[PDB]
Amino acid sequence: SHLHNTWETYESIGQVRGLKRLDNYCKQFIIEDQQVRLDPYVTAEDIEI
DNA sequence: GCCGCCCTGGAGAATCCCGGTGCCGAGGCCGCTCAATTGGTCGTAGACAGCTCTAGCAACCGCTTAAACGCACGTACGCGCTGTCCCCCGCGTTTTAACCGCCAAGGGGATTACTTCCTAGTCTCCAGGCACGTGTCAGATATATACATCC
């Protein structure tokens, strides 16, 4: 019900359904966020949008 | 004497069934309407008969000879088993475009009716192209006869 949202960890999850969604979120968000943070070819407009 | 708790009865509301009435799919009925029917006439397609000549057919012959058949051997290939690895399938997740519903105007094309004229059918006459047969002629082929030569 979006009120029982839990702050979890990979070892705290174990093996449940939807772990591929967690892997996809981790890969996309973390990899692309640190890519746009660490790239020197990033303007101020891109980082603020 | 006063106050709180457990047991049981009749009235108010929800649901199933039936009857009256309105709406969707299909069939009977009516009206147009054009194509099938009927009746008559005539030309000709085809049936029938007749004669001639050639191919086929049943059953036999005889001869030749090459193909078919039988047999032995051998070995190459079909097939079965095993390994392996790789690639396709199943599944979960994310994207994306098919699908449906919308403009906005305009052209293409299917009908209905009408006009016109060019071109193809039809008829008559004629002539030349096609089919068949034959005389003749030049190229190809085989041998007759004369000259140089080896033993």
Swiss-Prot record:
* Superkingdom per UniProt: Eukaryota
Null mutant: what phenotype? Answer: Decreased sensitivity to the cytotoxic effects of 6-azauracil.
What UniProt notes about the protein's domains is: The 2 chromodomains are involved in the binding to the histone H3 methyllysine at position 4 (H3K4me3). The CHD1 helical C-terminal domain (CHCT) binds DNA and nucleosomes.
User: Main role?
Assistant: ATP-dependent chromatin-remodeling factor which functions as substrate recognition component of the transcription regulatory histone acetylation (HAT) complexes SAGA and SLIK. It recognizes H3K4me. SAGA is involved in RNA polymerase II-dependent transcriptional regulation of approximately 10% of yeast genes. At the promoters, SAGA is required for recruitment of the basal transcription machinery.
The encoding gene: CHD1
Where is this protein localized, as stated in its record?
A: Nucleus
Q: How does it assemble?
A: Component of the 1.8 MDa SAGA complex, which consists of at least of TRA1, CHD1, SPT7, TAF5, ADA3, SGF73, SPT20/ADA5, SPT8, TAF12, TAF6, HFI1/ADA1, UBP8, GCN5, ADA2, SPT3, SGF29, TAF10, TAF9, SGF11 and SUS1. TAF5, TAF6, TAF9, TAF19, TAF12 and ADA1 seem to be present in 2 copies. SAGA is built of 5 distinct domains with specialized functions. Domain I (containing TRA1) probably represents the activator interaction surface.
Leftover remarks:
Present with 1620 molecules/cell in log phase SD medium.
| Shown part of the complete sequence | 221 to 269 of 1468
- Please state what the protein is called: Chromo domain-containing protein 1
Q: Which residues form a coiled coil?
A: none
Q: In which family does this protein belong, per the annotation? A: Belongs to the SNF2/RAD54 helicase family.
Q: Where is the signal peptide?
A: none
Q: Which organism is it from?
A: Saccharomyces cerevisiae (strain ATCC 204508 / S288c)
* Phenotype when changing H2Y: Confers interaction with methylated histone H3 'K-4'
